[PDB]
């Protein structure tokens, strides 16, 4: 029992982190096989960031403009190229610690673990869910750029995120490992406005199943609702529309607890309409949206 | 910016985890150097757990009673003994991955990372605090016993927790790495239950300090308080009494921010009496108590 925001164990990742310096800028890189991946803004000075032209900035660099340090050992860069918003550096050593891996592009509402890193050194690990608006609510300090986000399936690390930017409102923006930004954002230090973050509805439902699977059932009720009537309410509370696909996904949790998905939706509609009245669910006073159904099943069994 | 509850990276720990089986019971063990540490209850059947004499149960066992597996390599037990509530199994191979380490007994309110493990293989990692009532609010499932709690400083892992039991409220109990239970709990399946818990006042205050460090001052006020007057209020709200020792512990944060500790206490007292007004602090609608002053300084 119990339910916690749990990260994946970080050891496979920890062995891929390196430091990348270009001039006066140091940030993290990911060393897999014979390639190191890092934010392309490593090539920018702080002034540069105001209005960078990356292609211009890049040709003015050579393989040795880049110093890559793994632990002590310094790796010799023998190639460099730009893929979208990432720099790829070929190095002269293959990483002995490279895990089975893949690169994935995550869908909003999905979750992943982040290994916060400073100067190529791992500092902490936490779980965050990509927001609907494609931001994440992270803890990044200066020098955290290039820190990565991942999921682990069996022995295979699926890398999904690399940290690039902090938004004026304090939220964080980044790319997939092909260097394409999640969201509208760009690697320029200018005001860029986040969308409006809609609460994940599927996750909140999954959490309610977790709560039940953990014996917190006060919120349940005799009622049912149609999907349409649910949405008509949820959408007043800035909740994402619920779809049959979402309802289908919840089926296993529905089966495990015996509470029908639409019945849970009826509970939620009430919680939304009437608040929690000083009660808590799984210890929260708030409806939690950062757990996926998979997260609930992984954790709750 | 941002503030999140963060666990220590787990790789140094992941290297030490093994699976220990005795009879039909399988649980996790920690392999450091030539020794494997695990809950002594690995030796007890379900019916044993109701009323066990551990010394009686243990003499009945031999070294080969215990199967230790590191990944797919079987270790060979060449010795065994019991230390408080742990079994120490001597094995014929030393763990090549042993990190620098130590064993620490944590104090109530202090925090640590937990690597949840099943069948010797690490499943997840999370951050948690030792509650004033001596339990942890973990996420553990059957087979999680022997999973460990640790802090990392530099390259040294300090182990402070090993998982033993789940209590009726769904909270968890365990021992230090010498095998001594935190709290009044025992490794017997009895009616024992967690005591009433309290909020960790020291931690909430540290967290308020984090909030100002991170640029937020909304909850601050023009007032001050005596410690006693603070305790008088906070206690009504089920807060742990604040000690002078706690006030000193907060000294570095107080200096960093220019906010005297008792001035922060005044802020907290108002928050308690008035509530948060729909507002949040560091993204939370509630007063968070699982960040120690050290954690705050770490992260900030």
Topology:
2 copies of one chain form a homodimer.
Chain A: H1 11-14, E1 17-22, E2 25-32, E3 35-39, H2 46-50, H3 54-59, E4 66-69, E5 74-75, E6 77-83, E7 86-91, E8 100-103, E9 111-118, E10 121-129, E11 148-153, E12 156-166, E13 172-175, H4 201-213, H5 227-234, H6 244-249, H7 251-257, H8 261-274, H9 293-300
Parallel strand pairs in A: 8-12
Antiparallel strand pairs in A: 1-2, 1-4, 2-3, 3-7, 4-5, 6-7, 9-10, 9-11, 11-12, 12-13
Helix pairs in contact in A: 4-7, 4-9, 5-8
Question: Care to describe what's here?
Answer:
It is classed as hydrolase. Keywords: hydrolase proteinase converting, hydrolase. 2 copies of one chain form a homodimer. With 301 residues, chain A is of the alpha+beta class. Chain A has 3 domains: 1-14 and 100-197, Trypsin-like serine proteases (Thrombin, subunit H, Beta Barrel); 15-99, Thrombin, subunit H (Beta Barrel); 198-301, main proteinase (3clpro) structure, domain 3, CATH 1.10.1840. In chain A, 24% of the residues lie in helices and 27% in strands. The first copy, chain A, has 9 helices and 13 strands. The first copy, chain A, has helices at residues 11-14, 46-50, 54-59, 201-213, 227-234, 244-249, 251-257, 261-274, 293-300, and strands spanning 17-22, 25-32, 35-39, 66-69, 74-75, 77-83, 86-91, 100-103, 111-118, 121-129, 148-153, 156-166, 172-175. In chain A, the strands form 2 sheets. The first copy, chain A, has a 7-stranded antiparallel beta sheet with strand order 5-4-1-2-3-7-6, with no helix packed on it. In chain A, strands 8, 9, 10, 11, 12 and 13 form a 6-stranded mixed beta sheet that branches. In chain A, α4 runs parallel beside α7 (251-257). The radius of gyration of chain A is 22 Å and the shape is elongated. Chain A starts with 10 loop residues before the first helix and ends with a helix. In chain A, 45% of the residues are buried.
């Amino acid at each position: 029992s119990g339910f916690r925001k749990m990260a994946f164990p970080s050891g496979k990742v920890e062995g891929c982190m390196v430091q990348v310096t270009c001039g006066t800028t140091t940030l993290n890189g990911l060393w897999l096989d014979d390639t190191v991946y890092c934010p392309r803004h490593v090539i920018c000075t702080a002034e540069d960031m105001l209005n960078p032209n990356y292609e211009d900035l890049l040709i003015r660099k050579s393989n040795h403009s880049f110093l890559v340090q793994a632990g002590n050992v310094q790796l010799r860069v023998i190639g460099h190229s730009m893929q979208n918003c990432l720099l790829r550096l070929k190095v002269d050593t293959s990483n002995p610690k490279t895990p089975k891996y893949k690169f994935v592009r995550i869908q909003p509402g999905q979750t992943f673990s982040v290994l916060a890193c400073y100067n190529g050194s791992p500092s902490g690990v936490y779980q965050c869910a990509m927001r609907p608006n494609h931001t994440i609510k992270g803890s990044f300090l200066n020098g955290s750029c290039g820190s990565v986000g991942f999921n682990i399936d069996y022995d295979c690390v699926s890398f999904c995120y690399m940290h690039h930017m902090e938004l004026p409102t304090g939220v964080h923006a980044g790319t997939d490992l092909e260097g394409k930004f999640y969201g509208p954002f760009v690697d320029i230090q200018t005001a860029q406005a986040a969308g409006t973050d809609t609460t994940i509805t599927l996750n909140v439902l999954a959490w309610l199943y977790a709560a039940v699977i953990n014996g917190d059932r006060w919120f349940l009720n005799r009622f049912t609702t149609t999907l349409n009537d649910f949405n008509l309410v949820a959408m007043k509370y800035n909740y994402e529309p619920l779809t049959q696909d979402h309802v289908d996904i919840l089926g296993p949790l529905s089966a495990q607890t015996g509470i029908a998905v639409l019945d849970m939706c009826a509970a939620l509609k009430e919680l939304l309409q009437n608040g929690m009245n000083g009660r808590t669910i799984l210890g929260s006073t708030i409806l939690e949206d950062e757990f996926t159904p998979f997260d609930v099943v992984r954790q709750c069994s």
